[PDB]
């Protein structure tokens, strides 16, 4: 948990296929009272992020598994 | 010369008569796609042999 700072580091398209635009990882900048710690979570979760109103500056409750 | 000419001619005729594709249907499906299609793609990649799974998400256009 912590204040989120969403950012997607652009990555080359799937190397197994052609070229284009893809996202291999999604970094979330969870900031807690003790400090800050960015998490390079799986990109498939991006759907959940967009589902809820997860904007930069709110507290999110992430689950490990 | 004329020999290879007739060979290629009858080979083309045989190909035509035997043609009496799924890739073309996939390309048609692509045509029908409005264009902003996001593809969820995950493949097994190496680190049975030791390996792992990697996830990729391709975005067609910058709008999405």
């Amino acid at each position: 948990e912590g204040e989120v700072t969403e950012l997607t580091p652009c990555e080359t398209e799937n190397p197994m296929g052609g070229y284009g635009k893809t996202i291999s990882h999604v970094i979330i900048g969870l900031k807690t009272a003790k400090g800050t710690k960015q998490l390079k979570l799986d990109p498939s979760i991006f759907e959940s992020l967009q589902k809820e109103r997860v904007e930069a500056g709110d507290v999110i409750y992430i689950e490990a598994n | 010369l004329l020999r290879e000419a007739k060979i290629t001619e009858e080979l083309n005729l045989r190909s035509l008569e035997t043609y009496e594709a799924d890739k073309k249907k996939q390309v048609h499906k692509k045509r029908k796609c409005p264009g902003p299609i996001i593809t969820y793609h995950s493949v097994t990649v190496p680190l049975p042999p030791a390996r792992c799974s990697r996830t990729f998400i391709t975005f067609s256009d910058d709008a999405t």
Partner: peptide, 16 residues
């Protein structure tokens, strides 16, 4: 042979 080059490129991307 093509799949071999594809997986080699995937391994190169993993190393990168």
């Amino acid at each position: 042979n093509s799949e071999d080059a594809v997986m080699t490129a995937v391994r190169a991307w993993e190393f990168w």
